[PDB]
Scaffold this active site. Structure first.
Site, PDB file in Angstrom:
ATOM      1  N   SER A  33       8.786   0.037 -60.384  1.00 23.97           N
ATOM      2  CA  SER A  33       9.462  -0.964 -59.214  1.00 23.97           C
ATOM      3  C   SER A  33       8.132  -0.978 -58.209  1.00 23.97           C
ATOM      4  CB  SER A  33      10.433  -1.065 -58.617  1.00 23.97           C
ATOM      5  OG  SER A  33      10.704   0.102 -57.584  1.00 23.97           O
ATOM      6  N   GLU A  34       7.887  -1.548 -57.241  1.00 19.17           N
ATOM      7  CA  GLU A  34       7.118  -1.412 -56.378  1.00 19.17           C
ATOM      8  C   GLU A  34       7.934  -2.401 -55.059  1.00 19.17           C
ATOM      9  OE1 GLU A  34       3.516  -3.561 -55.399  1.00 19.17           O
ATOM     10  OE2 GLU A  34       2.286  -1.356 -56.659  1.00 19.17           O
ATOM     11  N   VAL A  35       8.432  -1.961 -53.728  1.00 16.43           N
ATOM     12  CA  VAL A  35       8.698  -2.323 -52.424  1.00 16.43           C
ATOM     13  C   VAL A  35       8.062  -2.158 -51.877  1.00 16.43           C
ATOM     14  CG1 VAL A  35      10.396  -0.761 -51.913  1.00 16.43           C
ATOM     15  CG2 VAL A  35      10.513  -0.426 -53.791  1.00 16.43           C
ATOM     16  N   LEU A  82       5.841  -0.853 -49.274  1.00 14.17           N
ATOM     17  CA  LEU A  82       6.499  -0.338 -48.450  1.00 14.17           C
ATOM     18  C   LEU A  82       6.313   1.326 -49.523  1.00 14.17           C
ATOM     19  CD1 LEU A  82       9.709  -1.002 -47.409  1.00 14.17           C
ATOM     20  CD2 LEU A  82       7.847  -0.379 -45.740  1.00 14.17           C
ATOM     21  N   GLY A  83       6.492   1.149 -50.578  1.00 14.27           N
ATOM     22  CA  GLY A  83       6.218   1.977 -51.730  1.00 14.27           C
ATOM     23  C   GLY A  83       6.247   1.601 -53.341  1.00 14.27           C
ATOM     24  N   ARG A  84       5.460   2.304 -53.927  1.00 19.03           N
ATOM     25  CA  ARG A  84       5.370   1.832 -55.784  1.00 19.03           C
ATOM     26  C   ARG A  84       6.142   3.172 -57.109  1.00 19.03           C
ATOM     27  NH1 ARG A  84      -0.747   2.739 -57.086  1.00 19.03           N
ATOM     28  NH2 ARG A  84      -0.522   4.015 -55.177  1.00 19.03           N
ATOM     29  N   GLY A  85       6.948   2.859 -57.247  1.00 21.48           N
ATOM     30  CA  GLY A  85       7.602   3.379 -58.284  1.00 21.48           C
ATOM     31  C   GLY A  85       7.286   3.274 -60.043  1.00 21.48           C
ATOM     32  N   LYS A  86       7.905   4.339 -60.890  1.00 27.84           N
ATOM     33  CA  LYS A  86       6.804   4.291 -62.318  1.00 27.84           C
ATOM     34  C   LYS A  86       6.983   2.534 -62.607  1.00 27.84           C
ATOM     35  CE  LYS A  86       6.939   5.856 -66.733  1.00 27.84           C
ATOM     36  NZ  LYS A  86       7.392   7.335 -67.431  1.00 27.84           N
ATOM     37  N   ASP A  95      18.619  11.839 -59.751  1.00 25.48           N
ATOM     38  CA  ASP A  95      17.329  11.607 -58.647  1.00 25.48           C
ATOM     39  C   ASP A  95      17.684  11.560 -57.862  1.00 25.48           C
ATOM     40  OD1 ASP A  95      14.737  11.748 -58.903  1.00 25.48           O
ATOM     41  OD2 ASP A  95      13.900   9.344 -59.198  1.00 25.48           O
TER      42      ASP A  95
END
Ligand SMILES: C=CCOc1cccc2c1-c1c(c3c(n1C(C)C)CCCC3=O)C2=O
Length: 327
Positions: free
Chosen positions: A46-48, A40-44, A151
């Site tokens: 984490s990956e989701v 679904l997405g990738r943060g600084k 945030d």
């Protein structure tokens, strides 16, 4: 100095274990119960993934935490534990690890999100009131629990526009509020950073989240997303000052004895405070009422102390149609 007008002492009045996240010992379950379905997405950090719990077929979201200080992991976990049951806060189902690598992951309830870019161009007046009220429930809840999100932005507000469900996600930057504590100003996304962050004022509070919420409200009622579109952190403050005014900025700085980075001297210019009605035109007029403008004016204020609290915002007349409907 400066202190929150609400919930200022609520961590002090709780057991130390409530807020001493470095001392928290999570119970780590087994990630092998989950099958990853799609990214679904990738943060600084984490990956989701969308996932299915193979033991009960529940669709969930798995946030796999990249290596970081275990301190940041404990912070997010303890915050989510403290927020359990909170209205419109993403539900943490479990804290799990790969049983071999010990990499930690957070399992959340699934939400079928409508991407905000398209959604925010088709909302009705009532929709905006409704979703802002739902988001305010989450912020009043976390603030009441002694926690600043830090945030708030559209990417962190999941909206299922079919079921009319809203969840505030990504508590990885969230922190406990303690009066007089100085906090890192390198939080929030550029377009949603309050002026306090942009002028390096560290003694901020829950009201930072109310600036960010105000930015979201402005983008929805005016259909300019993001509303304040800076090119960098310096230009972000310039964009704000072109609306709220430069003399007004200086009065804020003076009140709190805030030192202004001299690079602003060459870029702020001189700007009068603008009437919020200046942002109305034929494409957004049906979304902009006197009530909307009055609320917005009380959120997008330099002086973090005089911004409405989440509760004060919820009590504003703008939301009366929503409250009446939720009769
Ligand atoms: C297709 C969108 C749905 O996405 C969901 C749904 C349910 C719960 C969560 C998410 C989610 C989370 C987190 C992140 N997403 C997304 C935006 C990629 C990215 C940043 C870190 C984070 O925590 C949820 O917890």
């Amino acid at each position: 100095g400066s202190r929150a007008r609400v919930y200022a002492e609520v961590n002090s009045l709780r057991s130390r274990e409530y807020w001493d996240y470095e001392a928290h010992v999570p119970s780590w379950g087994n990630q092998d119960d989950y099958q990853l379905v799609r990214k679904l997405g990738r943060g600084k950090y984490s990956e989701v993934f969308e996932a299915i719990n193979i033991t009960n077929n529940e669709r969930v979201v798995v946030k796999i935490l990249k290596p970081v200080k275990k301190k940041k992991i404990k912070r997010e976990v303890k915050i989510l534990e403290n927020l359990r049951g909170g209205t419109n806060i993403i539900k943490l189902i479990d804290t799990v690890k790969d049983p071999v690598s010990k990499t930690p992951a957070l399992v959340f309830e699934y939400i079928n999100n409508t991407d905000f870019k398209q959604l925010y161009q088709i909302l009705t007046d009532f929709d905006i009131r409704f979703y802002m009220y739902e988001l305010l429930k989450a912020l009043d809840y976390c603030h009441s629990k002694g926690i600043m999100h830090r945030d708030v932005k559209p990417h962190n507000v999941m909206i299922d526009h079919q079921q009319k469900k809203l969840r505030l996600i990504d508590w990885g930057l969230a922190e406990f509020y303690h009066p007089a504590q100085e906090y890192n100003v390198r939080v929030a996304s550029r377009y949603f950073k309050g002026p306090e962050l942009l002028v390096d004022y560290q003694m901020y509070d829950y009201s930072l989240d109310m600036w960010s919420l105000g930015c979201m409200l402005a983008s929805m009622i005016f259909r300019r997303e993001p509303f304040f579109h800076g090119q960098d952190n310096y230009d972000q403050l310039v964009r704000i000052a072109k609306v709220l005014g430069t003399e007004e900025l200086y009065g804020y700085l003076k009140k709190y004895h805030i030192d202004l980075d001299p690079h602003f001297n060459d870029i702020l210019g001189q700007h009068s405070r603008k009437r919020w009605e200046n942002f109305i035109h034929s494409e957004n007029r049906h979304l902009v009422s006197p009530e909307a403008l009055d609320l917005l004016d009380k959120l997008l204020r330099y002086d973090h102390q005089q911004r409405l609290t989440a509760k004060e915002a919820m009590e504003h007349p703008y939301f009366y149609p929503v409250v009446k409907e939720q009769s």
